[PDB]
Each structure stands twice: as C-alpha cells, then as structure tokens.
Amino acid sequence: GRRPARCYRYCKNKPYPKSRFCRGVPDAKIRIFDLGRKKAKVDEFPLCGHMVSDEYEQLSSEALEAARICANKYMVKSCGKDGFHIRVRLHPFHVIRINKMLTGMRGAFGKPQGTVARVHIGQVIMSIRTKLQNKEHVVEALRRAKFKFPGRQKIHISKKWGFTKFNADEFEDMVAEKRLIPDGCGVKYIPNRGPLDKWRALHS
Amino acid sequence: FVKVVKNKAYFKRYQVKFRRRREGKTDYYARKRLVIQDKNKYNTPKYRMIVRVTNRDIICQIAYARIEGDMIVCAAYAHELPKYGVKVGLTNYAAAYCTGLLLARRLLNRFGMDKIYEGQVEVTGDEYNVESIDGQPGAFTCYLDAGLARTTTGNKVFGALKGAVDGGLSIPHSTKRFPGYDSESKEFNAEVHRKHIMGQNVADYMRYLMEEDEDAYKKQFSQYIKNNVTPDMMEEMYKKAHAAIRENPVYEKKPKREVKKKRWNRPKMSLAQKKDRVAQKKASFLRAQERA
Amino acid sequence: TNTKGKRRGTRYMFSRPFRKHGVVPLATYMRIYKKGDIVDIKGMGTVQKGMPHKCYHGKTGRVYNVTQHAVGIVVNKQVKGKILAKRINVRIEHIKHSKSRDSFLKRVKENDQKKKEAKEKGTWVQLKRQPAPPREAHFVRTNGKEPELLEPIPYEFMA
Amino acid sequence: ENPMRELRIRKLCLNICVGESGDRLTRAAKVLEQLTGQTPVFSKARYTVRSFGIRRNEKIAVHCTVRGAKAEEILEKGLKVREYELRKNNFSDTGNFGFGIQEHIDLGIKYDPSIGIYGLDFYVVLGRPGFSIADKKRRTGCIGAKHRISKEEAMRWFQQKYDGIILPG
RNA sequence: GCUUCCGUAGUGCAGCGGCUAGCACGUUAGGCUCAUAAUCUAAAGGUCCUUGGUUCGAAACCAUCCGGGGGCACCA
RNA sequence: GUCUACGGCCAUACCACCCUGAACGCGCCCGAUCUCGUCUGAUCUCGGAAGCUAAGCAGGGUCGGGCCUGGUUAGUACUUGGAUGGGAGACCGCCUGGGAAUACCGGGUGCUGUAGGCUU
RNA sequence: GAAACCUCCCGUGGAGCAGAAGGGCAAAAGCUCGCUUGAUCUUGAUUUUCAGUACGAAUACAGACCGUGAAAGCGGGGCCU
RNA sequence: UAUCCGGUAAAGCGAAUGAUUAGAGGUCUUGGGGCCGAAACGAUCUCAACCUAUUCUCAAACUUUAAAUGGGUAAGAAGCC
Ligand SMILES: [Mg+2]
Ligand SMILES: [Mg+2]
Ligand SMILES: [Mg+2]
Ligand SMILES: [Mg+2]
Ligand SMILES: [Mg+2]
Ligand SMILES: [Mg+2]
Ligand SMILES: [Mg+2]
Ligand SMILES: [Mg+2]
Ligand SMILES: [Mg+2]
Ligand SMILES: [Mg+2]
Ligand SMILES: [Mg+2]
C-alpha cells in the first residue's frame, strides 16, 4: 500500500502541518485518541503508567492506531471493559510526502501521503490510568504496545496521580486541605489569589 | 448569558491609548501638525495660542512645546474681568474678546513691546493684520489652538483670536469664520462683527425678554438685574473695560500664606493592613459558619 | 532566485512592537539634531514616507544635512569588499540618538576635571581606562562553621 | 430623596419599513410627516438580499426621532391605542422599551384611499439628567454603574407614570 | 502514474441551495369496453457511495476514502 | 494636601463593582433671540445660573482580572569553538564559554513640567 | 423569522483601505460630506538591483505658481513594498 | 568598556491566528434520531453549532517572551574651553 516506515522514521524535514498552504491532506488513520472508562473521576484510577520514547524520531498514525488496538484488547482481556483509561498523547500533524513515478527528478515535489508524529527523547507516547492492583497488566499492555513502534521505548509507572500534574504522596493532603478539586478526568488547582467570594463558596 | 468578549486574553492583547486621549482632552492628530517645529530651526519655540471655552470660564494661554512638557509663557483667564469692570457675563463672545485682548497686552508689556505695535485701538470690525516694522523688534507670531471645539462661523475661540489680533499679535487667520460672515454670498459685513464684539446680541435679547415677560427675563439674566446691568450700559461698559485693559494689563499674584496643611484626602492602605483585613474576613466567615 | 523589492522580508523589522501601536508620541517628533551628531537608525512601521532601507536598520552614522522634517546622515555600508560612507535622507521618526558618544563625552569631562585638579599639586593620577584586573587576593572568613558538603544527586527518571 | 435622578423619556423613535422602494416609501414618509410635523429620513440597505427583494443601497424604510413634549404626546397616543399594557419581554436590559402597531389610523390619522394602510413601530428611549456625557464631544465616558437604568426601574417608572397594567409572559 | 467523468427505488436517468427527491420502463390495483390490445392517471416504491466541515438549512459548495469507466506515456 | 488648562513618559495609568468629595474648580443643568447645523438645540454652536454631587472627574478599597518588576522553573532547554568520544544509525556524553521562556510564588497599582487658583 | 429597518450596551480593530501577501492605521490611512486638480512647470542631490552603469520606482530639499483649512501645516499621484 | 539592531534555536498557545483530545458545571439558544406524554424550557441524556474555568498534542509561510553566535558605532589634537 504505502512505503514502509524505514523511510519515514527520522525527523528529516521541517514540521509541515496541514494549513491553508498545505491542502489536500488525506485524513489520519487514528481518530479516537482516548478510551476505556474515560467517564471517571481522579479518585479511583491512581496508576499513571506511561510509555516514554528514547529516540528522536517519527511515529506513524497507523502504528498509533495498531498500538491503541493492541493495548485496548489486552486491557479488556485483563482488567475489564471499564476498568482502565488509555490516552495516546501523540496527535500526528506532520504531513509526509510521496514522490511516485510512472521526468523523474525534474520538478520533484511530493504530494501529501499521510500523517506522522514528531516524537522527542523523553516524550510520553501512551498513558494508562487504573487502580493500584493492576500494575503488571498495565506493564504488559505497554510491552505489547511497544512492538508496534520502531526504535526503543520504556515503561514507567510515574509518581503522579492518574492524569494530573500533582504528586501522589501529597495529592490526598492537598485534597484534604481543599487546594485541589476533583474535576472529571483532571484536577483543579486553587491558588490563594482569587476573590474571597470563591473562598466563601468553598469551605462550606 | 453572553460570549464574554472582555476576557483575560482581551486584557492581555488590549493596548491603552494615551492618557489625555483616554481623558478626552488632546487631539494628537491635530497637535502633531500644530506644534512641531521644522528641524532647520534647531532651537526656536513655536508659539501656540490655546483657547479653551469652559461653562463658567474662558482660558487663553500662549505656550511652546519642550521635551519635558510645554511651558506656558503667558496666561489669561476670563475671571480676571471683575478686576477690570466686567462684573457679569464672563463666558460670552465679548468676554472672549476681552480675554484675548488682555492676553495680548499682557504678553506685550511682559516682553517690552507695549509702545511699539499698539494694535487696533479704535475698534472698527474690518480685517486686520499686524505688519512688521523695520528698525524695531519684530511683531510676535503665534498660531491658534482651538483644541476639540468645532470651528464653525461665530465661535468664541475666534472671538479671542480677534481680541489677540486687535491686541497686536501677528496671527495668520481669515474672516471666513468670524460672526457676520454671509454663507451664501461670501462677503464680510464687518458691522455685525462689531455688534457681537461690543455685546449687542446679548443686549437685544435682554430688550426682547424685557418687552416679552419679566419672569423669563429674570430667570435668564438674574445676575444682570444684580449689579445694575442695563442693555444701554453694555457698550459703554465694554468700552471702559477695553480702556482698562489697554491702560493696565499687568498681572499681580497673591501672597499665599497661613495654611493649616491638613489632609482632606484619604491615605493609602498598607500591605499589613490589607493582609489583616482579608485574614479578619476569613476568620469572621469561619466564625459565622461555625454557628449552625 | 528571490525578488529585489525594497521591503523584502521586513515583516518584523519595519513593524511596531507589542502593545506599542497607535499614535507616535510627540517628543520623538521634536528631538533636535545638529551637524555631526552620532545617530543610530531604527525603522518604524507607522510613518512610511522617508523610510530608510532595511540594510540600514540598526546602523549608526553622522549627520551631514538637517532639512525641515528629515535628517541626512552619512552611514557606513559594506558593499562586499569595502566600507562606503554613503549619504541617506531619513525622516525623524526612524531616528534616535546614539548614546555611545555620551559616555565618551562624560569621560572626557571627567578627565578634564581630574586634569585641572592635581595639576598645581604635582601628583600624577592615572587617567586611562584599564580592564578587569586580577581579583586582589584576600581572606575568605567563616564564623566557626564548616563549608556545606555538596553531594551528586542520585538519578531518578522524570517522565 | 434623590435630587436629579428623575427618569425621563430621552427620545421616541418611529419607523415604518415598507420593504422595497419608491411610492410606498414616500407614502409612509407622508404618514410620518402628518403624524409628527417634521420631515422624516429614509433608510437604505446594508447589503443585497435576494429573498427579501432588496438590493444594496436601495431605500427601504423611513424613520424619525422625536424629542420632548411632542414625543410625550405621540407616546400618549400610542399607549392610548395599546391600552396602557406591555409585557415582561418588551423591556430591554438597558431600560428602554418599544412596541409596534398595525394601523396608523388608530393614532388619530384620517384614512385616505390614496395614502394607504401602514403599520408603524415606536421605541421609547428613556434617560436621566446626565446622559450627555456618553455622546458629547470632548470628555466622553461611561455613565456610572448604579446610574444606568435597570429593568426593575423601568417597570416601576412605567407603573408610576402611565398606570401600568403590565402582564407577565 | 497524470488529467479527469459518474455514484440518486429493480433499471435508464433527472433535479438554480428553500420540492411531497419531477418522471418513464417493471411489480399491485382501479376506471373504460360486449369483453380484450394501448391508455390517464394512483398506490408499499429510495443506506442521495461513505466520513468530516461551512451555512439557518446540503444530493447541489469544499477535503479524504471507497467502486464502474475514457484518453496520454517520444528518440536513441 | 488638592484642582483647572496645556502636557512628557503612554495600563504601576486600563477594565468590573463599592465607598468618600469641605472650598476653588470641572461638569451635570436652564433655554434657542443672535452666530451656527441637524428629522429632532440629542450632537455642534450661542445666551446663562434655579438646583447638584446623582453622573463624569479626584481619592481609597477588592485574599479582583490585567499590567510592571523579582524568585522558582534552572544552570534546565538551547548554543560558539574541540576531540582518531560512544553508537549500525537516530542521537547522546564530555572539555570550553555563554545562557532562556511557561506553569508556580512574592511586591507595587502612576511619577513629573509650565501657568493660575482653593484649603485666606 | 437566522439575515430587511429603528434603538441601547459591550465592542484594540477580530472590518475596511481596488487587487496577491506582509506591514501599517481608530475623533485614521476607514465611511459620508464640502472645495479642488501638487496627477503643474524647472535645476541638481540621494536610496533601491548595482559594476556602485542605466531604466523603472522612491526619498528629502530648492525656485515659482496653486488647491484646501480658521490656521498650524498637508499635497508636486494612489497607506508602503 | 558603554550604546542600539534582531525574532533564529528554545519555549508558549491556562496569551492572539490556524489545527486539535476528553471529562465537569450551566433551560444563553434552537434543531434531528429519540422514551414517558395529544403537547409542554414537565423528569432522562445525545450530537451540530453555545458559555464558563480545566486538560492532551502541535505550526517554515503562528507568536506574548526569547538566547548563544553575530552586525554597526565611540574609546580624542580632525578634541574640549
Ligand atoms: Mg529534506
Ligand atoms: Mg482639527
Ligand atoms: Mg440643551
Ligand atoms: Mg458627580
Ligand atoms: Mg458619588
Ligand atoms: Mg491581581
Ligand atoms: Mg480627519
Ligand atoms: Mg515646492
Ligand atoms: Mg488615500
Ligand atoms: Mg525570518
Ligand atoms: Mg521550534
């Protein structure tokens, strides 16, 4: 169908997204980026298992779709249909080009072929939040999802609380001090800079 | 509800205008063409003659711009006229003429040009321009500043302009926007202008209300019945006022002394006071909610 | 090849900075300029007549001609093999004063004052500049306590 | 005990939108001239709409803004037609109201077989002593925050002045 | 490969952004005739290929994908 | 201390709401005969003074938004020059010098010139 | 009625400036009015591609004659490329 | 040593322009498949376009910021008084 990912692996050109100038881009293979029991609160899924890349490369949207399907299938077979939440934190925007022959190189600029995602060294690819009794299944799901990407990846159970930017040892302390409000998939931080009517609407 | 236009992004992208623009006082597009001097002059003042009409005052100043802000070189206010004879009627066309005349004569005897360039002593009403006299110090030139007032035919800014011209300031102007100008035949009658300068427009309406009804006359001209101002006294009163301005236009200040130096303004609240206020409000809210 | 336009690639050069659009302030109009003043050039996007070329943006020359509402200036342009003292007519708003001469003039005034001083006294005072010297060896004291032992931190993976 | 916060009718805006052009437009102009005593001003279009039969800059409507006691008397005629009654939704958030009638002959205008049938539309703009700052020349400014006319104040002013029988809904 | 054309009842199709998707060949009445052939008109007739987007509103306008089909590809 | 007229720098000045204004002011305000222009003295212009701080305006306040200036982020990202350094590459590490920007957390919320008043 | 016309409020420009794009602009450089022909004549100097040669375009000026405005000033073509 | 120029790397989009993920709270406001109802903004949610604070990923022809390396100037007698 399309040219193999050996040729579209490395960050060779400038980031070339779809815009007013680049039109006629074929739509990406990955459509849904997060699933599981995504209609859930932060108080019940404190796992935060991440796939972190170790190479500065490009990952294709079809590989993202295949790894999403593999992780979804293993997590459904392991913990249940609604006992996890998987995000793919790489939205592909780099439009890759194709130069197909029947001239040759005479006036050789590429037509848009597909989408691909620039991935840095140390950037999170996929993230799974679930309970604390689910660590080995999350590690094995991310291990099965590493096999759909080129390069080298790592699996890290982070110190954060689910999909929040706050550390898990101090998360419950901040919730008990009501500096954090559980708000859907994420958390809401309360600084000491708002008006006093917000403080009076809280704490009562 | 509405889609809130004034968001945090709106205040971050929002650029304020100038301070006098936000107050609504300075036309910077007009002043950029008024006040700047050509660069081949290199140091000279460009004198402007600012006329500002107030509801109870007329301010006529002469200034020149500097980089630290402009400096007033001469000033004249319409409330200096009770020192000269005009007790009442401080904001009309004749008061603008007297304010401009006093501004011109004050600038002339503060520069030393009292005797040379006498101006138009006998008021006629025609066109008048101050011509430079050879062998003498030259005539003062300055350019009019009306500001944010719509300059139509018959403005008190132009009355003060005519007063400065009759005082002897070499200002370039025209008789197109003096009162008495005919709009459909385009000539200058130069007698209606004399009537407006001497104040016959007010006195004829005083006579009109006096023959119409006493109550509306008193309501319109309450301080003209006060101080015994009759319509037949008006022209001779402005003649004596012009003579007083021509004989003594110098200004004297007052010895500002014996001030108790108290503070009518409220002082600014400090950081510890604001922190203690919000701490006391938090503690009072907690004490109020620990009741039921 | 590219194009040979006068404002080719002046999207950020001949533009106004952030939240500084609008009316040009009037002291900028009423700076004064004499012959021989050291003057730097910064283009302004609002005023468009009398605008210098983009190869003079940031260059500094001396004033040779002062017209009514513009200033002629002798700038230095390196045309590939030689520096040419060439004369350009730039309007006032694209022009500031260069303060590279002001510190020199204050140093000349200070040297003239310190030369008139101590001339009848007989003492010789160094008037030249001098670069950063060695740091004039001293004692580093401590009030009984020891220096804090630094430790290389153990590695832990952030992401 | 407020000395000069007395709410007054600042103006009354009349319009007739005949829709197309020409003879109906000048006939409604004659209707407004016989109603007021002053020559009204026509209003052209903003852009061409094919479904409404209008083109760009084509004169569509006619309007007239009346100040003072004549506006008071014309609004007395209008409430004399409309039975002193209004609704909750007829009042705006800034304290100005309006209503439209379908026959101009209810205002005391005699019928004419030539000068035909025209409905018209009133809009009362209420004011205070001190709203000249928002439209004067030099020192413009927003007229306070507690100085603006509210919907509650418009309701109680209408019920105090014209004996309002305002019905909800 | 490149320039394209069309995806609309079982079928050939049509459709000026605002219609009840005209209508014909089939299937099923029914009127008429002495009964039949043609009819002059009705009913149960639509995965507008699919997805996404602007507009108040989409078959009609734009972008990708999916099926049937036309033409160009020269010298050693 | 404070105001008016003209300002320089052009948010430390703006925006939302609340409170306070003695005096001089500044305006709100009363009318359309004259000058003037409008569908309408609403705007502009003119002639005034019965009321007024209601509004503008001035000052203060908001665990205010914004803005200005610092710490954290962080010697982090990046980057001049160097190596017969690593690695299949991608990239990474070191020597040598410089060195940010978010989020996060503190302080502040206009100075000043000219001329003339008021608190005699 | 979602779009016809009238009014109030918010409205840093998110519209418009003939076109392609960029920059610029809020009592304008936009819209509507009133008057006009600086889109006139004549010497030089300078910038832009540049060899520092042209042409085209532009920049301040100089001498006249003018237009506009109450004047400051602005204008010797198009808001600049 | 002082004095200006940038808009590149980086970073940001809880800041503008363009793309783009998912929850939470609000009849802004209608409409379609819908369920209880002849209907109802009467209870349940849905998406197209709505709002409010959040959250994920970006931009050679985006940017509030913003380096390192650079580019001009002055370091005197051709200057001061
Ligand atoms: Mg390449
Ligand atoms: Mg003006
Ligand atoms: Mg009035
Ligand atoms: Mg007030
Ligand atoms: Mg008050
Ligand atoms: Mg704040
Ligand atoms: Mg103008
Ligand atoms: Mg000339
Ligand atoms: Mg033009
Ligand atoms: Mg660039
Ligand atoms: Mg980058």
Q: In the 3-class helix/strand/coil scheme, how is C84-136 assigned residue by residue?
A: EEEEEEEEHHHECCCCCCHHHHHHHHHHHHHHHCCCCCCCCCCCCCCCCCCCC
d(CA C134, CA C29): 48
Tokens of residue C53, six digits: 């070329």
Q: Which of B77, B113, B112 is nearest to B95 (CA)?
A: B77
What SS3 class is residue A54? Answer: coil
3-state secondary structure of A34: strand
Query: Do A84 and A129 meet the contact criterion of CB atoms below 8 Å apart?
Result: yes
Distance CA B86, CA B98 (A): 9
Cα A177–A178–A183 angle (5° rounding)? 145
Q: What is the CA radius of gyration of chain B?
A: 26
CA of C17 to the centre of ligand 2 (A): 28
d(CA A88, CA A93): 14
Phi, psi of A71 (to 5 degrees): -65, -40
Q: Report yes or no: C58 and C41 within 8 Å, Cβ to Cβ.
A: yes
How distant is C1' of E52 from CA of A108, in Å? 31
Residue with tokens 């803004």, as numbered in its chain: D65
Q: Are A119 and A55 in contact (CB under 8 A)?
A: yes
Rounded (5°) CA angle A181-A183-A188: 50
Pairs across A and B, CB distance < 8 A: 10
User: Do B76 and B82 contact (CB within 8 A), yes or no?
Assistant: no
b/e map of D138-165 (b: 16 or more CB within 10 Å)?
A: eeeeeeeeeeebeeeebbebbeeeeebe
> d(Cα B128, Cα B142) in Å, to the nearest integer?
15
Buried b (16+ CB within 10 A) or exposed e, D79-95: bebeeeebeeeebeeeb
Helix or strand holding residue B75 (H, E): strand B71-77
Q: Please name which of B52, B51, B49 lies closest in space to residue B63, comparing C-alpha atoms.
A: B49
C-alpha atoms less than 13 angstroms from C-alpha of B80 in its C-beta half-sphere: 23
How far is Cα A9 from Cα A3, in angstroms, rounded to an integer? Answer: 11
Give residue B211's identity as a one-letter amino acid code: E
Distance A22 CA to E13 C1' (A): 39
Q: What is the CA radius of gyration of chain D?
A: 18
Quickly give C56 CA vs G61 C1' distance in Å: 21
**Residues A163, A169, A173, A176: is their CA dihedral positive or negative?**
positive
Number of neighbours of residue A41 by Cβ within 10 angstroms: 13
Say whether B185 sits in a helix, a strand or coil: coil
Contact at 8 Å (CB) between A88 and A125? yes
Residues B201-215 as b or e (16 or more Cβ within 10 Å = b):
bbbeebeebeeeeee
CB A116 within 8 A of CB A94: yes
* Contacts (Cβ under 8 Å, ≥6 apart) of A53: A59, A119, A120, A121, A122, A123, A125, A151, A152, A153, A154
Contact in structure between B72 and B63 (CB atoms under 8 Å): yes
Shortest distance, CA B92 to any CA of chain D (angstroms): 20
B104: which 2 tokens? 């011109």
Residue B281 is nearest to which of A196, A203, A204, comparing CB atoms?
A: A196
Q: What is the CA radius of gyration of chain C?
A: 26
Q: For residue A12, report the distance from its CA to the centre of ligand 1, in Å.
A: 6
Torsion sign over Cα B82, B83, B85, B86: negative
Q: Name every residue whose Cβ is closer than 8 Å to that of residue A176 and which is 6 or more positions away in sequence.
A: none
D133: nearest CA partner in chain B: B24
Q: How far is CA B213 from CA B203, B216, B232, C10, in A?
A: 15, 6, 19, 74
Q: Which nt sits closest to A101, CA to C1'?
A: E1
Residue keyed to tokens 């206020």: B277
- Cα–Cα nearest to B91, from B212, B210, B199, B248: B199
Q: What is the DSSP letter of B28?
A: H
CA distance C40 to A111: 48
CB-based contact A196 B289, cutoff 8 Å: no
Structure tokens at A80: 């249940």
Q: Is strand F within 7 Å of residue B99 (CB)?
A: no
Q: How far is the CA of B289 from the centre of ligand 6 (A)?
A: 28
Spatial CB neighbours of A127, under 8 Å, sequence gap ≥ 6: A48, A49, A50, A51, A86, A87, A89, A163
Structure tokens at B279: 């701490």
D:100-139 residues touching chain B, CB 8 A cutoff: 137-139
Contacts of B147 in chain D (CB under 8 A): 138
Name the experimental technique.
cryo-EM
Question: And the tokens for B161?
Answer: 């302009």
- Whether residue C139 lies within 8 A of chain A, CB to CB, comes out as no
Count Cβ neighbours within 10 Å for each residue of A130-154 and write b for 16 or more, e otherwise: beeebeebbeebbeebbebbbeebe
Rg (CA), chain A: 21
**Is some CB atom of chain B closer than 8 A to the CB atom of C49?**
no
B67 touches chain C (CB under 8 A): yes
Q: Is the CB of A24 under 7 A from strand E?
A: yes
Question: ∠ CA B257-B262-B268 to the nearest 5 degrees?
Answer: 140
Decide: helix, strand or coil at residue C159.
Answer: coil
B156's CB contacts (< 8 A; 6+ apart) are B51, B53, B58, B92, B93, B96
| Residue C90 CB-density burial (10 A; 0-12 exposed, 13-18 middle, 19+ buried) | buried
Q: Cβ distance A167 to A161 under 8 Å?
A: yes
Q: Which helix (H) or strand (E) holds D15?
A: strand D8-17
Q: Searching chain A, which residue's CA lies closest to the CA of residue B277?
A: A196
How is residue D26 written in tokens? 């000048």
CA distance B173 to B165: 9
d(CA D15, CA C108): 79
- Nearest to residue D165, comparing CAs of D87, D75, D109, D91? D87
Is residue D13 within 8 Å of residue D122, measured between CB atoms? yes
**Phi-psi group of B219: left, alpha or beta (phi > 0 → left; psi -120 to 50 → alpha; rest → beta):** alpha
User: What's chain B's length in residues?
Assistant: 292
d(CA D41, CA D52): 22
A192, closest residue in chain B (CA to CA): B278
Instruction: Give the nearest nucleotide to A26, CA to C1'.
Output: E64
Dihedral sign of CA atoms C38, C41, C46, C52 in order: positive
| A176 vs A170: CA distance, rounded Å | 10
The burial class, CB within 10 Å (0-12 / 13-18 / 19+), for B94 is buried
CA atoms of C132 and B206, how far apart (whole Å): 86
Separation of CA A25 and ligand 11 centre (Å)? 22
Q: What's the angle, vertex CA C114, arms to CA C112 and CA C119, rounded to 5?
A: 100
Q: Do the beta carbons of residue B198 and residue B166 sit within 8 Å?
A: no
Please report, for residues A4, A54, B131, B202, B284, the alpha-carbon distance to residue A15 in angstroms, rounded to integers and kept in the order given: 20, 20, 74, 79, 57
Q: Hey, how many other C-beta atoms are within 10 angstroms of the C-beta on A46?
A: 17
Tell me what percent of chain A is helix, strand and coil, each rounded to the nearest 5. Answer: 25, 25, 50
Rounded to the nearest whole angstrom, what is the distance from the C-alpha of residue D52 to the centroid of ligand 11? 52
* Dihedral sign (CA C117, C122, C127, C132): negative
Token pair for residue B92?
A: 């009309």
Type of residue found at A115 = T
Nearest to B282 by CA among D141, A38, A202, D111: A202
In strand F, the nucleotides that come within 7 Å of a protein beta carbon are 1-2, 4-11, 13-20, 22-23, 25-30, 33-37, 39-68, 89-92, 104-120
Angstrom distances, CA of residue A24 to CA of A108, A159, B248, D155? 18, 43, 87, 59
